[PDB]
Ligand SMILES: NC(=O)c1ccc[n+]([C@@H]2O[C@H](COP(=O)([O-])OP(=O)(O)OC[C@H]3O[C@@H](n4cnc5c(N)ncnc54)[C@H](O)[C@@H]3O)[C@@H](O)[C@H]2O)c1
């Protein structure tokens with residue numbers, strides 16, 4: 110006996126993911142499994158789209174009436190030119206990773222920061238009204254620092270090395286202090302004495318850099334274990350490995366820890382809720398993915 | 400060893416589109432997604448509501464998206480050549496495109512309905528190559544069939560159609576056939592029953608390529624009387640919903656061998672499937688699932 114098994118028919122609609130490289134992404138599995146579970150007639154697909162293709166793809170998407178899509182490197186900071194509106198965070202961050210189409214009007218959103226903050230809250234970590242020291246000034250750190258500010262974190266000390274992102278960090282600081290009530294400051298990651306004071310004075314220490322992840326597995330920006338203390342919360346955006354070097358040291362010091370699994374899941378949920386006004390079953394998806 | 404990921408669509412899966420409007424009740428996506436699943440090809444087929452105002456932006460967007468290919472239907476078949484790079488011989492002579500394939504950034508337009516019709520006949524043991532056909536219709540499907548038929552080597556084709564918007568198209572099709580193929584084509588009024596009787600009597604096959612037999616015209620047929628048919632004559636209809644139109648009902652009763660449009664539909668898909676993947680769609684397996 111043989112019958113129809115494909116849930117994809119002429120009624121099925123598309124949610125995209127446009128970036129490059131991108132085909133190894135886990136996001137399609139996340140959303141497809143989420144749609145399947147909820148009985149939603151959508152499929153999610155990734156497309157290799159870069160600078161040269163971006164304008165055409167978005168015009169194409171409007172013409173195809175797509176409900177929305179994700180956007181990843183190297184399009185996140187450029188896509189606003191082809192959108193109609195931006196969420197407060199996208200406008201403040203200057204990056205878009207999620208687009209939604211409402212009656213032809215394209216609104217750009219940024220869900221990485223939201224996801225990160227949500228994952229903390231779900232993990233039972235309250236950093237609202239408290240201080241955070243964070244490493245990094247890239248796409249993720251920026252979204253985290255701004256969403257954190259917008260959510261009510263009182264103070265953020267940012268540490269980054271003197272590379273291509275330091276100037277972005279400076280903007281993040283300036284953006285945070287001028288258009289937010291959160292107080293932010295930037296420090297060189299090599300300023301180890303300042304790093305010590307900032308960590309001691311923070312309820313959370315967060316890695317938002319590629320350090321800890323390939324090609325830097327087994328490496329941490331943390332110079333010494335004695336900069337951590339038992340009550341300190343230590344988090345990392347990295348989740349492959351499930352325990353970075355930083356999170357290993359953290360456990361050894363008695364700290365409570367959290368890798369990036371939560372953040373990737375909840376940034377997916379955010380996107381999903383934006384497109385469907387439904388809650389992604391994170392616990393279910395989590396099981397399926399890991 | 401457990402693997403709950405039951406969804407075969409990942410960041411690797413590529414897209415084959417269908418652009419037209421209306422188009423969401425189309426069966427094509429089931430057809431290809433089932434074929435892809437069965438063969439293990441990492442592809443998915445989706446439909447998009449695309450019409451005149453959206454066509455140019457969509458095709459330009461599929462190029463940017465580097466899609467492998469897509470199907471095209473009403474009302475885009477005759478306008479799409481404008482945004483393509485090359486056309487198959489049949490696509491250029493027909494002037495319509497229903498299938499596009501992207502080879503290294505170069506988009507080629509193909510027309511598979513005529514190909515699908517002829518293939519279905521051959522699979523059903525009917526050889527009309529070098530013979531005469533009488534056909535009813537002057538719409539997209541009839542035009543594709545007549546032109547492909549001529550290209551495949553049909554010797555002569557008598558076309559019948561009512562005096563509606565399509566008659567002018569028929570005349571054009573006749574001219575295309577006579578001037579660029581070795582086939583002889585003539586056009587007659589469908590209400591000229593005596594010419595119809597004669598053409599059918601001189602043909603090896605009689606084909607309906609109009610919407611008569613299909614709702615809102617079920618139970619109805621353009622064939623004025625059973626008298627015009629005979630046991631040897633092959634009678635075919637492009638319609639397959641219903642699977643047995645009044646025409647095929649009458650033809651059967653007169654001892655004729657019949658064939659509905661179910662093969663045309665399957666083999667039109669098969670052709671597309673083959674232009675895109677260079678593989679054979681398993682028609683037999685897909686027919687079980689669909690119908
Ligand atoms: N959990 C999630 O869902 C999630 C989401 C986004 C990003 N991430 C992870 O966060 C990390 C950074 O992402 P991004 O998009 O912001 O990257 P990015 O390229 O935008 O930023 C790179 C950041 O890491 C720093 N950096 C890189 N190499 C370094 C080194 N050797 N020493 C010191 N600092 C270094 C840079 O200064 C900068 O702050 C990646 O590992 C990524 O996988 C995780």
Ligand SMILES: NC(=O)c1ccc[n+]([C@@H]2O[C@H](COP(=O)([O-])OP(=O)(O)OC[C@H]3O[C@@H](n4cnc5c(N)ncnc54)[C@H](O)[C@@H]3O)[C@@H](O)[C@H]2O)c1
Pocket residue numbers: 512535536537538539540541560561563565608609610611613616621637638639660661662663664665667
């Ligand atoms: N088997 C397949 O895969 C396949 C593929 C394409 C079309 N079709 C079917 O073939 C039929 C025609 O397709 P098309 O796209 O060429 O249609 P079309 O709208 O382009 O053309 C309609 C044709 O039918 C004729 N017609 C319609 N109503 C009539 C009537 N009451 N009396 C006399 N003539 C009439 C017109 O004269 C014209 O030639 C439809 O029923 C369609 O569903 C089947």
